[PDB]
Amino acid sequence: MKLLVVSWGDFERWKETKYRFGGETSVGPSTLPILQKVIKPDWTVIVLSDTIGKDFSSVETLREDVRNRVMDFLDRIGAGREVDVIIAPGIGEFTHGSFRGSAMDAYYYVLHALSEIIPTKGDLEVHFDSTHGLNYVTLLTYRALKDLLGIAAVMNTVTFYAYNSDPFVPKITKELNINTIETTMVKPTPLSEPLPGFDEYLCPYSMERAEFVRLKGSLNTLKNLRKEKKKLEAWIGSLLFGLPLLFLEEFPDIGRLESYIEELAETWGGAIAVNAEEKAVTRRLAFGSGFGTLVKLLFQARITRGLLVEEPYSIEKLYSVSDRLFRGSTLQRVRVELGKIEDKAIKYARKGAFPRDIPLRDFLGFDNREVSPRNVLAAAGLEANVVEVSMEAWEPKRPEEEAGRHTHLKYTPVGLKKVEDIVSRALKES
């Protein structure tokens, strides 16, 4: 999949020029047609600021004014069908209107929009045009894109190319090159941040705290999240620290994460006040870092959801999951720990012994019944005192080959809680 993302300011102001890119030539006010010709993207995303809007009756007459103006220009320059337009929350005081709120809302809003567009299956080739962006919207768009691609790179190959034309001097410029300014193979970066305290999903920008405290208290999301926070952190830690059984046992409910994000996104949009007379938009709520963390969390669940199976979890399944998810010394520790349990399973199978629900410590022949954070993290979450082993009997013929399919691991109810506390806490000390 080839994805073209561009960052746009006030496109109506741009002058007709000739662009050079990919041995080709184009005349027009925008880089977009020549980028689309040379790259042949499967999909185009335009990120714009709502600050170019002039119809001030409401949020919807605002978005409609901006959206119609973008499509007029796209048809005029011949941009095409296969385009999403993200109308991001901008700020400032202009001829036609006044826009007030957190400058950082643009990051959370673009992060939320890109998370619903970037495919969560297969390899990505991502192209990014910074030539026409407002500096802060361009920089926040770049960051939002790179944050999501890093998570995508855990499961798939992701490459990223950035472009910028030469600088335009009004009136004297005829021709501009489109330069390549970045070529990267994006590195796998699982989510490495805990969920924050409950004052950090939505923040008052200009809302009186009576209204804020009442609003915060009326949200299902904040209540349900308090309940689930530690299980979700256990899951984030599972990918960051290399704990493949915890990855499967704590795999999050995607429908619940979606509703959390939707409730927060609509509470934010709900607090947007438009004064038709003053031509003034006030985003009385600001997104917090927690909204960002929930969006990255749902994206990561979507990217890895194809690994999930129903219990029970075999050694063979723990190996295959680990091979997709983990790298470096973390993969190799997983393989050592699974290999020791497998080696033992083989010895039992060779004796026609098929123990069930046996504490891992007895399975391995240990005698330190205390659960240590050190050993939970260092042994890939397969600590002797929190895991139960079951071998489902079969007729062994080549036991070396077979034990792995037929040996299952799970956390004991007590063990799972102690692992959740350990992993959650390790995530917060970072």
Ligand X SMILES: Nc1ncnc2c1ncn2[C@@H]1O[C@H](CO)[C@@H](OP(=O)(O)OC[C@@H]2O[C@H](n3cnc4c(N)ncnc43)[C@H]3OP(=O)(O)O[C@H]32)[C@H]1O
Alpha carbons 145 and 430: distance in angstroms, whole number: 23
Q: % helix / strand / coil in the chain, to the nearest 5?
A: 45, 20, 30
Q: Which is nearer to ligand X, 20 or 229 (CB)?
A: 20
Residue 8 has which token pair? 């746009």
Contact between 54 and 14 under an 8 Å Cβ cutoff? The reply is: no
Strand partners, 100: 282
Residue 264 has which token pair? 């927060």
Q: Which is nearer to its own copies, 104 or 274 (CB)?
A: 104
Tell me which residue has tokens 């969390």.
Answer: 297
Binder among 20, 29, 198, 219 for ligand X (CB under 6 A): 29
Taking CB within 5 to 8 Å according to partner kind, which of ligand X, its own copies, none is near residue 91?
Answer: its own copies
**Backbone conformation region of residue 219, classed left if phi is above 0, alpha if psi is from -120 to 50, else beta:** beta
Q: Would you count residue 95 as binding its own copies (CB under 8 A)? A: yes
Binder among 25, 58, 68, 135 for ligand X (CB under 6 A): 135
Contact between 303 and 188 under an 8 Å Cβ cutoff? The reply is: no
Nearest CA to 279 among 95, 5, 18, 34?
95
Alpha carbons 300 and 382: distance in angstroms, whole number: 23
Site string for ligand X, 152-181 (x = CB under 6 A): -------------x-xxx------x-----
Q: Which is nearer to ligand X, 52 or 191 (CB)?
A: 52
Q: Would you count residue 130 as binding its own copies (CB under 8 A)? A: yes
Strand partners, 411: 387
Nearest CA to 405 among 388, 392, 424, 419?
392
Binder among 3, 5, 45, 52 for ligand X (CB under 6 A): 52
Q: Would you count residue 44 as binding ligand X (CB under 6 A)? A: no
Q: Would you count residue 92 as binding its own copies (CB under 8 A)? A: yes
Alpha carbons 416 and 418: distance in angstroms, whole number: 6
- Tell me how crowded residue 423 is: count the other CB atoms within 10 A of its CB: 26
Binder among 181, 213, 254, 353 for its own copies (CB under 8 A): 181
Q: How far is the CB of 332 from its own copies (least distance, A)?
A: 4
Q: Which is nearer to its own copies, 57 or 332 (CB)?
A: 332
Q: Would you count residue 125 as binding ligand X (CB under 6 A)? A: no
Q: Would you count residue 351 as binding its own copies (CB under 8 A)? A: no
Q: At what angle do helices 254-270 and 105-115 cross, to 10 degrees?
A: 140
Residues 70-109 that bind ligand X (CB under 6 A): 90, 94
Q: Is the bond into 396 cis (omega within 30 degrees of 0)? A: no
- Tell me how crowded residue 379 is: count the other CB atoms within 10 A of its CB: 21
Site string for its own copies, 138-167 (x = CB under 8 A): xxx-xx------------------x-x-xx
Residues of this chain that interact with its own copies (CB under 8 A) are: 9, 51, 91-95, 103-104, 106-107, 130-131, 133-136, 138-140, 142-143, 162, 164, 166-167, 169, 172-177, 179-183, 185, 187, 192, 237, 240-243, 327-333, 335-336, 373-375, 377-380, 426, 430
Residues of this chain that interact with ligand X (CB under 6 A) are: 9-10, 13-15, 17, 29, 49, 51-52, 90, 94, 131-132, 134-135, 165, 167-169, 176
